């Protein structure tokens, strides 16, 4: 790859600079190069990978939603559809890149619970992003692949992590969004979000000194979705 000649530590360092400069495509490129060195990623490095690609794909999803809304409202020339398809193809390409890195390099049987849950959560998310723009026999394959990855992550997180762990919380938040927005299962979504919030609250003393601000943020977002969904 384009990053193959750079030392791993330099790639990490440049990803941090790219984050500071809000150059998220660069920072995704640096982190992909780091992943391709074939060594595990620490928690801090998983965060860099996550932030970079989420920023990239987030901007594409936002663009796709604008174009799709313009498109549907003109279904009430080919240019809107062509440009929406262009952005769509690029978004799919980024999700394919992430899902390929997860399968080729990051997801494995070894490693701590955080890493295993985090990468499986990632896999569920990027299948969910593919599902947001999918239609045909592609779309069934995609939705099940998302649910499957989320379910593996949930099983591990319930067995290995406290119910306030921010990866476990963020996973459950994102699975409940899958249920509501992707799987047309509002009751599964309210159920999962309610269980997750209540169980975190029931074992609030398990909050960690180094991540409680993240935990309490996700529980507030669970509550916001519950409010929106009821």
């Amino acid at each position: 790859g384009a990053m193959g000649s750079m030392e791993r530590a330099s790639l990490i360092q440049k990803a941090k600079l790219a984050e500071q400069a809000e150059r998220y495509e660069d920072m995704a490129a640096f982190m992909k190069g780091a992943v391709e060195k074939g060594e595990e990623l620490s928690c801090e490095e998983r965060n860099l990978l996550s932030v970079a690609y989420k920023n990239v794909v987030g901007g594409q999803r936002a663009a796709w939603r604008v174009l799709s809304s313009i498109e549907q409202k003109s279904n009430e020339g080919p240019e809107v559809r062509e440009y929406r398809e262009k952005v769509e193809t690029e978004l799919q390409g980024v999700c394919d890149t992430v899902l390929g890195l997860l399968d080729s390099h990051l997801i494995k049987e070894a490693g701590d619970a955080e890493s295993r849950v985090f990468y499986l959560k990632m896999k569920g998310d990027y299948y969910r992003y593919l599902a947001e723009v999918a239609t045909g026999d592609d779309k069934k394959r995609i939705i099940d692949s998302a649910r499957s990855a989320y379910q593996e992550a949930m099983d591990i997180s319930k067995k290995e992590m406290p119910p306030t762990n921010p990866i476990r919380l963020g996973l459950a938040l994102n699975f409940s969004v899958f249920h509501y927005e992707i799987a047309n299962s509002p009751e599964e979504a309210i159920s999962l979000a309610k269980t997750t919030f209540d169980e975190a609250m029931a074992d609030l003393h398990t909050l960690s000194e180094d991540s409680y601000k993240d935990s309490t943020l996700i529980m507030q977002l669970l509550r916001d979705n519950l409010t929106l969904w009821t």
């Binding site: 965060n47 927005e181 977002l221 979705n225 929106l228």
Partner: peptide, 10 residues
Amino acid sequence: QRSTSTPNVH
């Protein structure tokens, strides 16, 4: 309104 998913942080 759209459901909220896990945000970017740190």
